[PDB]
From a paper:
DING is a family of proteins with molecular mass of approximately 40 kDa, with a conserved N-terminal sequence of DINGGG. DING proteins are one of three families within a superfamily of bacterial phosphate-binding proteins. To date, the crystal structures of two DING proteins, i.e. human phosphate-binding protein (HPBP) and DING protein from Pseudomonas fluorescens SBW25 (PflDING), have been reported. In both structures, a phosphate ion was captured in a binding cleft between two domains.
Numbering used by the authors: 1 to 376
The structure:
């Protein structure tokens, strides 16, 4: 079997029949931090107890760090080939909450920032929401790509809190003044563990969190129910009151469509393949959009260019052919699970480097992978 796992944000997508193609074992959702370790160190123990199995790929919504990349290049690349890091799909980060009320909850960015810094501790501080009583933040206990995507937004946009939010996979380490300002914030493990805490009816109402849109509501329609999933983006633009948007994929697709391709000359560097959003556009960073739903990013795949086993090599190529295909692809499934397909130019770029046989970066390239590859 080809063994993969990691990020929980897209786990239900990868578990959907026929999204992963022939030869792939069922995806094991354990978090992006564990997915990166599993791949980089070939440690199946991050996925399960059968450590005779080898790891072949990971899902991650946390980018590979400079240290991770350099260590793999020195330790693993000579025998296993280059690693490949590519976007899989684009995603919003949803803000589901448990607090009854007929009114739409529509967070301004300033309000969102105050909720997650602890400055706003009561629902009455959310204008127009018609709710009052304590807010309780639920967050991911472990190294999480959802946390990275979310804190990247807070770092860029929460610019008038007492403290500042650092970009991190560990939410408890983000705010400069710590979690102490929050009263009774609750940590849970996995997208599912956080949603279970959010939905726990044995505690008082008031909980709020950040979440994969595939987990944030039971169906796509539920993402548009602003009594359960917050709109974000409420404000005033050119003198006129604007409403925020739901985290439905339709509200981030336009912004995703104009994300620049990775710089051609540097496409051998896995770091350039995953765009990150930031306050301002420039130097590889893409500005968070001023229209549509504001909190977005990419979730990614990590693969090897080379596999020791030729059948596995072919099966990996078949998966890339589908997932990045012009047609006969996974786009319908991607949308059904609340995500945004990659734009056509992005699919073409991924194919041109990693599929097209003549390219030096292509999976299973006979010249590059001659006598090399990850173990089967």
């Amino acid at each position: 079997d080809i063994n993969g796992g990691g990020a929980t944000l897209p786990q239900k997508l990868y578990l959907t029949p026929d999204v992963l193609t022939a030869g792939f074992a069922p995806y094991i959702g354990v978090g992006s931090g564990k997915g990166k370790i599993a791949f980089l160190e070939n440690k199946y123990n991050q996925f399960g107890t059968d450590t005779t199995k080898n790891v072949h790929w990971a899902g991650s919504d946390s980018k590979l760090t400079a240290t991770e990349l350099a260590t793999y290049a020195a330790d693993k690349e000579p025998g296993w080939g280059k690693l490949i890091q590519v976007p899989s799909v684009a995603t919003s980060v949803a803000i589901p909450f448990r607090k009854a009320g007929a009114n739409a909850v529509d967070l301004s960015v300033k309000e969102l920032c105050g909720v997650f810094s602890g400055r706003i501790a009561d629902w009455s501080g959310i204008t127009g929401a018609g709710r009052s009583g304590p807010i309780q933040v639920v967050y991911r206990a472990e190294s999480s790509g959802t946390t990275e995507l979310f804190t990247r937004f807070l770092n860029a946009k929460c610019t008038t809190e007492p403290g500042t939010f650092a970009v991190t996979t560990t939410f408890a380490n983000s705010y400069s003044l710590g979690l102490t300002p929050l009263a009774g914030a609750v940590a849970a493990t996995g997208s599912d563990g956080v949603m279970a805490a959010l939905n726990d009816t044995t505690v008082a109402e008031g909980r709020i969190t950040y979440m994969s849109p595939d987990f944030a509501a039971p169906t796509l329609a539920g993402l548009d129910d602003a009594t359960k999933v917050a709109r974000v983006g409420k404000g005033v633009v050119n003198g006129v009151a604007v409403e925020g948007k739901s985290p439905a994929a339709a509200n981030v697709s336009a912004a995703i469509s104009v994300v620049p391709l990775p710089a051609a000359a540097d496409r051998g560097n896995p770091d350039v393949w995953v765009p990150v959003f930031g306050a301002t556009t420039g130097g590889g960073v893409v500005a968070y959009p001023d229209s549509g739903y504001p909190i977005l990013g990419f979730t990614n795949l990590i693969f090897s260019q080379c596999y020791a086993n030729a059948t596995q090599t072919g099966q990996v190529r078949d998966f890339f052919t589908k997932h990045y295909g012009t047609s006969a692809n996974n786009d319908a499934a991607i949308e059904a699970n609340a995500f945004v397909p990659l734009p056509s130019n992005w699919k073409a770029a991924v194919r041109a480097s990693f599929l097209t046989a003549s390219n030096a970066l292509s999976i299973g390239n006979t010249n590059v992978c001659n006598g090399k590859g990850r173990p089967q």
